[PDB]
Symmetry: C2
Subunit: 178 residues, 2 copies
């Protein structure tokens, strides 16, 4: 395809399909700026949030709105991991991740200020689209290295091969890249 | 004194005083991870958002939670402009800017997909702390060059210099770094 149509919690959109590798096509989700879809995806996921989760962690800047809206509906705080160290950080813990996009070295970074918020806590990862499990595996290694246990993974979409323990609101198929 | 007290609409916080420059400390405000404080600042600013504003534009990742909450409260859409070009963007428009603290080159980027959301519309720039205005005149010119009209600047705090063309909820001084 060229754009992939999809409807999530009653909100209708047409996701663009773009080349992401050798010649790879995936439908691109962007919640950044989409107040409506953000709030819908969040109200739907909050209902399917295991009550034992105490804290939310998100790796992507695009899912910060979903993580914030999710935090407000559930009352559970949320933590933001970044791709590099930021001047506001304290004694960040970093974990290295290699990409599918370019195969370049990537970092996943946790603010040192957020450790008392992860340590001893049951964590749910929150992402906009959870893919194969390369950055996913690294985020939980990051979280678990500072004291948290990942007990759930939430997203808007699952992608590629259909996992079982993600709480998603839909699944996107892989496409022929044209 | 290692921290600066602050109060927003009944939410009390104590901001760490941390060093940002050669001889300078600032009170650190971070809405990423503070759901309670974000929602408070957004309720207070909605009350003070000039009613002719049709769109909210923010340049910082750190104020994305406030821009989103603000868009939910007021019903007006929100735009996130970035510091580099991103893979989701379509036909991006850019602007040159010299930052402060880094004092090195910065870029300000508006997604082309965001120009219809700004062209011909009355705009509010949204930020978490307006200190310098390195990005304030550069962001305003980027917006006005594609058709937008900047009619307001919103923020939680002004810093150092008490800007007057800003709608803020408080003012933060500079500190001497122990």
């Amino acid at each position: 395809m060229r754009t992939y149509p999809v409807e999530i919690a009653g909100v209708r959109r047409e996701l663009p399909i773009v080349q992401v590798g050798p010649g790879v096509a995936v439908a691109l989700l962007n919640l950044l700026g989409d107040t409506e879809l953000t709030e819908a995806a969040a109200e739907a996921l909050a209902k399917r949030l295991p009550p034992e989760v105490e804290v939310l962690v998100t790796p992507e800047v695009k899912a910060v709105p979903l993580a914030h809206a999710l935090s407000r509906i559930t009352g559970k705080p949320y933590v933001v991991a970044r791709k590099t160290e930021k001047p506001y950080m304290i004694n960040p813990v970093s974990r290295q991740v290699l990409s599918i996009t370019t195969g370049k070295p990537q970092l996943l970074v946790l603010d040192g200020a957020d450790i008392p918020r992860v340590r001893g806590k049951k964590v749910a990862i929150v992402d906009d689209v959870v893919s194969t499990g390369s950055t996913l595996a690294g985020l939980r290694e990051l979280i678990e290295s500072v004291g948290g246990e990942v007990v759930a993974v939430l997203a808007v979409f699952t992608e590629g091969t259909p996992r079982q323990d993600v709480v998603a609101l839909g699944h996107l198929p892989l496409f022929k890249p044209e």
